[PDB]
Structure 1
Amino acid sequence: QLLQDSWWNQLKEEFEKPYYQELREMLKREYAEQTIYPDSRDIFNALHYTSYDDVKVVILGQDPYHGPGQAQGLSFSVKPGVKQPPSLKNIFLELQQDIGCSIPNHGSLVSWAKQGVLLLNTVLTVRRGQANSHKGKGWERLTDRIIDVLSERERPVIFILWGRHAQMKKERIDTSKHFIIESTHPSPFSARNGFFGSRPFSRANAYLEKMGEAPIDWCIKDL
């Protein structure tokens, strides 16, 4: 058993399948032979921090950061102590305009995860310095199933889908129950084309309040 009960009860069948065994064997070799991010112990951190029952909001990313000291097994977040990359800075700028939060002295979003924000990347590992190097190795099959089981959940989920790749997952999500907040990506190429001014954080909280759920405290505190 690789995950806590509420996730394992939804996903255990996937981990038994040939594609996962093949992926696991590839990763055992690559972690031993080269530099893979995030650290192997951190691969499932988004699910460790945010149980299936506790999910309130999902923020979908693509693959992990590919530089030393960055990836935590969470979409967008970085370990405390490293520079915040440009997209993450833009996330904090929007958060500041939307909610009012000051810009933090680190880029770790663990606080969000602990409050029910599932920081799910669709690909969970990457080779150092080589973006998208673990594309098509099996992760997308598993993370599609994670999206499926969230879509199947009775209690509504709020999905925040930034950019074109994240928006492609709309087809997997049952919008008769779930909520979608979508915009252009926070990358500097696209942030000023819709992401800025989209107010995703207050919008998410407004959906939560309508459902009688406690809102997220989005502001990140300095370390």
Structure 2
Amino acid sequence: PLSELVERGWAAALEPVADQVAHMGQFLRAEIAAGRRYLPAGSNVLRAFTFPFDNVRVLIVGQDPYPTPGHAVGLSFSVAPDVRPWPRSLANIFDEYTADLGYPLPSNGDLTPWAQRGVLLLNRVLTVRPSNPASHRGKGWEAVTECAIRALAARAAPLVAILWGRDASTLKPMLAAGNCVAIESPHPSPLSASRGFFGSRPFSRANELLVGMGAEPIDWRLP
């Protein structure tokens, strides 16, 4: 049951899609039975929902997990600490991190500290077939992650949304019910690079927006 898979707040928030989450478990088992693989590891698929729902203050949305074996870890854009070199998307994120915040380059690609601090690193689709980008689109995850985003937007708490998966016209309606939701626009993605992403100041703007809504800023600093 959801209560065993995710954090208590998320289990309640995702109750309307509990049957669909069970169906995705069936889908993944059927993939292995059919001789196909999936990433991330089963134990990491729902990892973004293992950090507390009530404490989320920034939503960073991606589209699909990394398709390269050993990259996807269940937090959008993150990689395991032993992964090197970083994927291009993450290298671009880190360049912006250094430019926006003035911090040196991180030691590795693990974004766990952001998750701990209330940054929800959510992909719209939570699995992928290795080496086959975007291969699990339309398999059932979109309803689950829509429920998640709508539940976040309905909280009385502040939220800043950062849209790094394009798809803004799909996502913005999900964030509309919100009373204390600010969406960063425009919506370059990390691979936009110098055609809008670099200089987008997503981290410092998120903090400016949070503080303007009466919330504490995120400490973005990575080790």
Instruction: Tell me the TM-score normalized by structure 1.
Output: 0.91
Q: Secondary structure at the match of 2:96?
A: helix
Deviation at 1:169, TM superposition (A): 0.2
- Corresponding position of 1:9: 12
Gaps of 5+ in 2: none
1:88 and 1:127, CA in 2 relative to 1: closer, same or farther beyond 3 A?
same
Question: Aligned to 2:88, which of 86, 89, 98?
Answer: 86
Q: d(CA) in 1 for partners of 2:110 and 2:63?
A: 17
RMSD: 1.6
- Corresponding position of 2:73: 72
1:177 and 2:180 matched? yes
Deviation at 1:176, TM superposition (A): 4.3
Question: Aligned to 1:164, which of 163, 166, 182?
Answer: 166
Residue deviations 1:79-112 (CA, integer Å, cap 9, x gap): 1111211111111111111101111231111010
Q: d(CA) in 1 for partners of 2:170 and 2:194?
A: 21
Q: d(CA) in 2 for partners of 1:61 and 1:202?
A: 19
Q: d(CA) in 2 for partners of 1:114 and 1:31?
A: 32
Q: Secondary structure at the match of 1:37?
A: coil
Moved over 4 A (4+): none
Q: d(CA) in 1 for partners of 2:69 and 2:78?
A: 14
1:94 and 1:61, CA in 2 relative to 1: closer, same or farther beyond 3 A?
same
Question: Aligned to 1:131, which of 120, 130, 133?
Answer: 133
Letter in 2 for 1:14: V
User: In 1, are the aligned partners of 2:62 and 2:165 still within 8 Å (CA)?
Assistant: no
Q: Calculate percent identity across the aligned residue pairs.
A: 44
Q: d(CA) in 1 for partners of 2:23 and 2:56?
A: 29
Gaps of 5+ in 1: none
Q: d(CA) in 2 for partners of 1:138 and 1:24?
A: 10
Letter in 2 for 1:132: A
Aligned length: 216
- Corresponding position of 1:152: 154
Q: d(CA) in 2 for partners of 1:92 and 1:163?
A: 17
User: In 2, are the aligned partners of 1:60 and 1:166 still within 8 Å (CA)?
Assistant: no
- Corresponding position of 2:144: 142
Q: d(CA) in 1 for partners of 2:140 and 2:165?
A: 22
Instruction: Tell me the TM-score normalized by structure 2.
Output: 0.91
